[PDB]
UniProtKB/Swiss-Prot annotation:
Protein name: Serine protease 1
Catalytic activity, reaction form: Preferential cleavage: Arg-|-Xaa, Lys-|-Xaa
CC per GO annotation: extracellular space; serine protease inhibitor complex
Keyword NAD in record: no
Tissue: Synthesized in the acinar cells of the pancreas.
SMART domains (alphabetical): Tryp_SPc
Every Peptidase S1 domain range: 1-221
Subunit structure: Interacts with SERPINA1.
Molecular function via GO: endopeptidase activity; metal ion binding; serine-type endopeptidase activity; serpin family protein binding
Pfam family for this entry, one: Trypsin
Binding residues annotated for Ca(2+), in chain numbering: 52, 54, 57, 62
Localization: Secreted, Extracellular space
Enzyme Commission numbers on file: 3.4.21.4
Length: 224
């Protein structure tokens, strides 16, 4: 996250870190056994780390649980980043508490101008790299269809929305991928892609979670 602020320990209790001996992507806990992240985050050997603040120090409240299933959308297209969504099933159920909590899936799509909370341990610099110990946060509005598509001619599908700031300076970034965009208490976005980070006229682009709710429900139901 570029241009954000320190969330404070466990204030985003559905934020998880995906770890393969290092932090590489975010995710969102949607029930005690399942995480939503980005398809582009797929790899084998995924460990899910819940209850994190400082990802470099054991502080208490951490729960680490291996992914037992990693399910990339069957239509995920890598070059176009279309359908950038992945479900992770945890080997065992997480213990849910004030510091490890699920986030609700939307019941409808959000609108342009809606203010959301985007969070992550991703790069904090739009020029060069700096990685934070503790979870960072950014409030950002959802942009109009027209603005999103002007920003990224060719590239915007209906499973994508832009959120953030055209003047530059405030964005998600590398390492935030798969992480949450939460608006009015609902998971509406998944950090997906953008051209650099926090660049003028180039806002972040996010997986449109409202289109995937039935797919999410169906995939879980059939992976019992
Ligand atoms: Ca920790």
């Amino acid at each position: 996250i570029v241009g954000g602020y320190t969330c404070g320990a466990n204030t985003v209790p559905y934020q998880v870190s995906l770890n393969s001996g290092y932090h590489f992507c975010g995710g969102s806990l949607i029930n005690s056994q399942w995480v939503v992240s980005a398809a582009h985050c797929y790899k084998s050997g995924i460990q899910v780390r819940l209850g994190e603040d400082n990802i470099n120090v054991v502080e208490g409240n951490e729960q680490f649980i291996s992914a037992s299933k990693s399910i990339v959308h069957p239509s995920y297209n890598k070059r176009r980043k279309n359908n950038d969504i992945m479900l992770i099933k945890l080997k065992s159920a997480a213990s849910l508490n004030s510091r490890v909590a699920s986030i609700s899936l939307p019941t409808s799509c959000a609108s342009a101008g809606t203010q959301c909370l985007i969070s992550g341990w991703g790069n904090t610099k739009s020029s060069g790299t700096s990685y934070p110990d503790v979870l960072k946060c950014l409030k950002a509005p959802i942009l109009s269809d027209s603005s999103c598509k002007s920003a990224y001619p060719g590239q915007i599908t209906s499973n994508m929305f832009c959120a953030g700031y055209l003047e530059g300076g405030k964005d998600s970034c590398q390492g935030d991928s798969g992480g949450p965009v939460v608006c009015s208490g609902k998971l509406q976005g998944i950090v997906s892609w953008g051209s650099g980070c926090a660049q003028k006229n180039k806002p972040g682009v996010y997986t449109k979670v409202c289109n995937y709710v039935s797919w999410i429900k169906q995939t879980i139901a059939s992976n019992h």
